[PDB]
Amino acid sequence: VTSIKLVLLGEAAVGKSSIVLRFVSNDFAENKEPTIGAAFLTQRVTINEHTVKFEIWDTAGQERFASLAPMYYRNAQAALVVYDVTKPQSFIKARHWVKELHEQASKDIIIALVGNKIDMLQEGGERKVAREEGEKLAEEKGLLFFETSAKTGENVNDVFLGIGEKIPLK
């Protein structure tokens, strides 16, 4: 068993808590309420005979909680920087989160850039962050890159496995 300290960061309402609920409980709530400060969750994944245990701090993305974020990313081994593919503002905030982690988090943190809510693009939804622009930011800044839907589950497990496949196991 190998534990991995992970933090989620990103603008309010991009779906951080929904990504974690999908990963931990395989559930989705259209009425998920804003997180208060942060929430802790765990989930285990199997890689061959290894158990990889994620210790997850799901931070609140509202500015009223912004000064709590450093305590949760301070000793994180992995971060998910989440934006909403239908909200270009949230991608500007993702860019700022990547620079803050490069300045202030551990020098050996692994970062995944995650564009969420892609299910919305198959209904009444506008893609306002091209996948290629997410990929470009990830390539330039040395991040993993995924697009996800917490609502359908699409690629959510792939995000967490992609991180666990890059950290040495016990």
Ligand X SMILES: Nc1nc2c(ncn2[C@@H]2O[C@H](COP(=O)(O)OP(=O)(O)O)[C@@H](O)[C@H]2O)c(=O)[nH]1
- Residues annotated in a binding site for GTP: 10-17, 58-62, 116-119
CA distance 10 to 149: 15
Q: Give the footprint of Mg ion on this chain (CB under 5 A).
A: 16-17, 35
Rg (CA), the chain: 15
Binding-site residue positions:
10-17, 58-62, 116-119
Residue ranges of the alpha helices (H) in 12-128?
A: 16-25, 69-73, 88-104
By CB under 6 A, residue 46 contacts ligand X: no
Q: Which SS3 state, helix, strand or coil, does residue 110 take? A: strand
By CB under 6 A, residue 161 contacts ligand X: no
By CB under 6 A, residue 56 contacts ligand GNP: no
Query: Of 14 and 81, which CB lies nearer to ligand GNP in the complex structure?
Result: 14
By CB under 6 A, residue 77 contacts ligand GNP: no
Contact between 115 and 147 (Cβ < 8 Å): yes
Interactions with ligand GNP, residue window 80-109 (CB under 6 A): none
Query: Of 5 and 151, which CB lies nearer to ligand X in the complex structure?
Result: 5
**Among residues 134, 149, 160, 164, the one that binds ligand GNP under rule CB under 6 A:** 149
Token pair in block for residue 124: 């009444």
* Phi/psi at 27 (5° precision): -125, 165
